[PDB]
């Protein structure tokens, strides 16, 4: 009979942990995570915003960071497949970014993640198609050509995730709403495409 006390001793721990987990899940499902690969921001995550939290309209964001991590990315990037939006700060130089982006896109576990993007850098010898493409233009041609190349990489995989190219080079005061407003859209479309309604 003395073996009928540890039963209650164990069931009390059970019934206390099933009262703490149902109160931690309500703060786990109210914060959306992020990622800041491609390059350390230092202009979009330290001066404007390895977790680095913040808040807009009573919602919090676990804006992670992989700056201190190594170069070979094929092992610590397959365990970020549950994040909502892989922010991507970016400024041969550009071809490396393009070949990173194509791989993040066509990856198998990062397949259904909606890559936000950030052209922080706001030429013809490394790009010969610069003359046979048309949308002072001395900046618009370059800017929109880089963006058109990225979108031509993004629109060839579907319809489960879209690249949202933005532009920012100023002091970046309101560079947080451009992530909030543009992370709302990802949840909206993630529901619409599931209700067979878009």
């Amino acid at each position: 009979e003395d073996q009928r006390n540890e039963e209650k001793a164990q069931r009390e721990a059970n019934k206390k942990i099933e009262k703490q987990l149902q109160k931690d899940k309500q703060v786990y499902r109210a914060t959306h995570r992020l990622l800041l690969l491609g390059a350390g921001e230092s202009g979009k995550s330290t001066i404007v915003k390895f977790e680095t939290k913040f808040q807009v309209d009573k919602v919090n964001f676990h804006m992670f960071d992989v700056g201190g991590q190594r170069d070979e990315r094929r092992k610590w990037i397959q365990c970020f497949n549950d994040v909502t939006a892989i922010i991507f700060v970016v400024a041969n130089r550009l071809q490396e970014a393009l070949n990173l982006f194509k791989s993040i896109w066509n990856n198998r576990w990062l397949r259904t993640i909606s890559v936000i993007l950030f052209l922080n850098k706001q030429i013809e010898d490394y790009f010969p198609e610069f003359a046979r493409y048309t949308t002072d233009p001395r900046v618009t041609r370059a800017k929109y050509f880089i963006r058109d190349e990225f979108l031509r990489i993004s629109t060839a995989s579907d319809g489960r995730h879209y690249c949202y190219p933005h532009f920012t080079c100023a002091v970046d005061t309101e560079n947080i709403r451009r992530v909030f407003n543009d992370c709302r859209d990802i949840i909206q479309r993630m529901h619409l495409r599931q209700y067979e309604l878009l």
């Binding site: 164990q10 069931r11 721990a13 059970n14 942990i17 987990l21 931690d24 365990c79 549950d82």
Partner: peptide, 19 residues
């Protein structure tokens, strides 16, 4: 698990001995 938890399970009565 990546949820920020480490749960010491059991395998005879399935209870969360710790969290």
């Amino acid at each position: 698990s990546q949820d920020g938890k480490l749960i010491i399970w059991d395998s005879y009565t399935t209870n969360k001995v710790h969290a």
